[PDB]
Design a protein around this ligand. Structure first.
Ligand SMILES: Nc1nc2c([nH]c(=O)n2[C@H]2C[C@H](O)[C@@H](COP(=O)(O)OP(=O)(O)OP(=O)(O)O)O2)c(=O)[nH]1
Ligand SMILES: [Cu+2]
Ligand SMILES: [Cu+2]
Length: 153
């Protein structure tokens, strides 16, 4: 298993997603994040990746979710810690990896996000902390999942 982060930049009626321009999940919208490095906590990793990919800074993040990901015929698990950045400083800025864009919450193009996102985004937007596991047949196809709400992490 490998540690990753995912940070959703949320304002009362809109979210700043990023169009992944290269790498894993290229061509889909997503939150900002990446691998957690040796020598940083998960949260600091989430903050560093948000700053790097969007030019945005935060005082704090909310822990909102935790989801493990599995691909059929690959033993390597992605242990993804999901944060909400409720309040950001600075100006959204395109990076080599991400082009930030704002979407009003009822207009998020779920068709162009990872397919799991349409399952847990509703929990996110209702402020319900969640735990889950998703097993993908391929990058477009969920084979199996479980998802539940938790009171804390
Ligand atoms: N919304 C969503 N995010 C996912 C899914 N699967 C998945 O790995 N992620 C997130 C976790 C990370 O933010 C990102 C994968 O990390 P990455 O490898 O692209 O990050 P990165 O290149 O920036 O890593 P770094 O080397 O920059 O640290 O995608 C998914 O199914 N849905
Ligand atoms: Cu907050
Ligand atoms: Cu402030």
């Amino acid at each position: 298993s490998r540690l990753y982060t995912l940070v959703l930049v949320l304002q009362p009626q809109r979210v700043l997603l990023g169009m992944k321009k290269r790498g894993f999940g290229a061509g889909r919208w997503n939150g900002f994040g990446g691998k957690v490095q040796e020598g940083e906590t998960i949260e600091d990793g989430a903050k560093r990746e948000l700053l790097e990919e969007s030019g945005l800074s935060v005082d704090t993040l909310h822990k909102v979710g935790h989801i493990s990901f599995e691909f059929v015929g690959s033993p390597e698990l992605m242990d993804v810690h999901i944060f909400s950045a409720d309040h950001v400083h600075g100006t959204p800025t395109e990076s080599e990896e991400m082009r930030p864009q704002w979407f009003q919450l009822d207009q998020i193009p779920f068709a162009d996000l990872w397919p799991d996102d349409s399952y847990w985004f509703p929990l996110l937007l209702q402020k319900k902390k969640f735990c889950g596991h998703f097993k993908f047949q391929d990058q477009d196809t969920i084979l199996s999942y479980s998802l539940r709400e938790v009171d804390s992490f």
